[PDB]
């Protein structure tokens, strides 16, 4: 019987690992805590506010890409998932039940 | 009872490798202490989490791409840096030893020996000491089959209040005449 023959694992960002708990479920429970926008401060450092946050964020969740890309991934997977769209449409459902 | 034995350097046959073996000699020639590395650091840019290199050899390779399973785990090829802060050296010198002129036999040239003195024993060889020094004597690779061979340092043995103890002289007399008498007391 066959004696082994390799192959190449590979890895890849993927909706069942953004949804873990590390995923989206981290936004929303540090998003509204740590990016605060303010009147007192310029544009460039409030965009630099919410960006830092998100970018620390994808980092922690998927450490391979560039921010520009994991930006690009999400959009993309977002456009092209019913899970994640289930659990988007159940954000705003949550809310709209509010 | 082979370490306690004092060898001349030319009796150290090349069936005593391996082994804790004391040698009889006369240090020719010390290097400055140098900083051998015995665990390379290295800090990850893209993870954080260093990675560590233990050093065996007279060379070592620098790593590069993360091993470590925080970027493995996510294929992510970050990149290895040195550190030296975080690595740890130890404190090498070399030193060589070379047989007394009573342990060289009739028309021989006087032959020496590469010693290797790592940690706190470093700097307790000077040139010039008459010392015993026991250590393991060992191969390097570079020939082909001819080995480099060194001596690793163990141990050392050398073998070679005032200001009320002056007044013994003072109070003894006679100070300039026997002072000057006891240079090269032998001499008329
Ligand atoms: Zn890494």
Same mark, same amino acid.
């Given at each position: 019987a066959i004696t082994a023959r390799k192959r190449r694992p590979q890895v890849k960002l993927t909706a069942e690992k953004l949804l873990s708990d590390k995923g989206l479920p981290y936004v929303l429970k540090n998003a509204h805590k740590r990016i605060r926008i303010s009147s007192k401060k310029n544009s460039y450092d409030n965009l630099s506010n919410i960006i830092q946050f998100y970018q620390l964020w994808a980092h922690e969740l998927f450490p391979k890409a560039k921010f520009k890309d994991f930006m690009k991934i999400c959009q993309t997977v977002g456009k092209t998932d019913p899970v994640l769209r289930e659990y988007r449409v159940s954000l705003f459902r949550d809310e709209m039940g509010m | 009872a082979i370490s306690s034995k004092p060898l001349s350097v030319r009796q150290?046959? @090349? =069936?005593? %490798?391996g082994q804790l073996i004391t040698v009889r000699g006369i240090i020719t020639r010390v290097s400055d202490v140098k900083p051998a590395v015995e665990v390379i650091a290295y800090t990850c =840019?893209?993870? @954080?989490?260093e990675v560590f290199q233990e050093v065996n050899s007279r060379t070592f390779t620098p790593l590069s791409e993360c091993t470590s399973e925080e970027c493995s785990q996510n294929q992510t090829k970050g990149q290895l840096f040195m550190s030296t802060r975080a690595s740890k050296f130890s404190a090498f010198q070399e030193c060589k030893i070379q047989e007394l002129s009573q342990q060289v036999? /009739? @028309?021989?040239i006087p032959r020496s020996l590469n010693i290797h003195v790592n940690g706190? %024993? /470093?700097?307790s060889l000077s040139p010039g000491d008459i010392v015993d020094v026991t250590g393991i004597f060992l191969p390097a690779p570079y020939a082909g089959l001819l080995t480099e061979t060194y001596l690793e340092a163990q141990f050392v043995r050398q073998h070679k209040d005032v200001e009320e103890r002056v007044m013994e002289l003072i109070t003894s007399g006679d100070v300039y005449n026997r002072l000057a008498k006891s240079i090269a007391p032998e001499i008329y």
């Open positions: - | 150290i046959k @090349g =069936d005593f %490798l =840019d893209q993870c @954080g989490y036999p /009739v @028309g021989h706190t %024993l /470093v700097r």
